[PDB]
Every structure is written in structure tokens, then in C-alpha cells.
Amino acid sequence: KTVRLVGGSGAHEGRVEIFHQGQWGTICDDRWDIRAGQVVCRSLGYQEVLAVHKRAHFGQGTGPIWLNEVMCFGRESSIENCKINQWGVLSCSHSEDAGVTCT
């Protein structure tokens, strides 16, 4: 599994982290929307997204920020199948790390 949620009350919620080129890294909140939240939640086996969260709601991550320019229509099987302009982000900081709450 290349996606995990960290820092939440339970495993159904947290900061979104994605594993890419040997490293777990985070997602910037700039373009973070409920369609991407649905993709993340369902790829983790949950029926629905309940909320997306910005501004390191579940604490800041460390390490790379892997995604910022990612656009999901909502029915992709994983965030890696959303439209990703590039991997690796220098225009954000971990204070912007994105989060989700699922089912």
C-alpha cells in the first residue's frame, strides 16, 4: 500500500502520506479537494470521504512533499492514477500538509 494516514484519532483519518521513490512524503493543501479525498479514502478501503483538511490539521509531516499539482475527477482507484503534473514540491512547506477523514 502506497498511501497511509497519520496523526489522526483512528486509522480512518489523518495526514495523507504517499510512498514514492523509496520515501514517504506528504501532499500540499494548495489544490487539495474533496475529489482527491474520496480517491484516497476509497483506495484505503473506506466507503466514503467525510472531510478534507488543510494547513497540517493532523500535524506536520517531515521529509519530501511529494504532490501539489494533482487533480482527481473522483473515481480513480488511487491517487497515483490522478493527474499529476510533477512529483516533488518546493513551493510548499509542511505547515500545508493535507489531511482527510474517511468513513
Chain contacts with Ca ion (rule: CB under 5 A): 29-30, 96
Element (DSSP H or E) covering residue 46: none
Q: Which residue, 81 or 93, is less far from Ca ion as judged by CB? A: 93
Largest Cα span, the chain: 33
Nearest alpha carbon to residue 65 among 42, 84, 87: 87
Cβ 96 to Ca ion shortest distance, Å: 4
Cβ 68 to Ca ion shortest distance, Å: 9
Cβ 55 to Ca ion shortest distance, Å: 7
Closest chain position to Ca ion (CB): 96
Q: Which residue, 42 or 57, is less far from Ca ion as judged by CB? A: 57
C-alpha cell at 103: 468513513
Nearest alpha carbon to residue 34 among 48, 18, 19, 20: 48
Q: Which residue, 13 or 29, is less far from Ca ion as judged by CB? A: 29
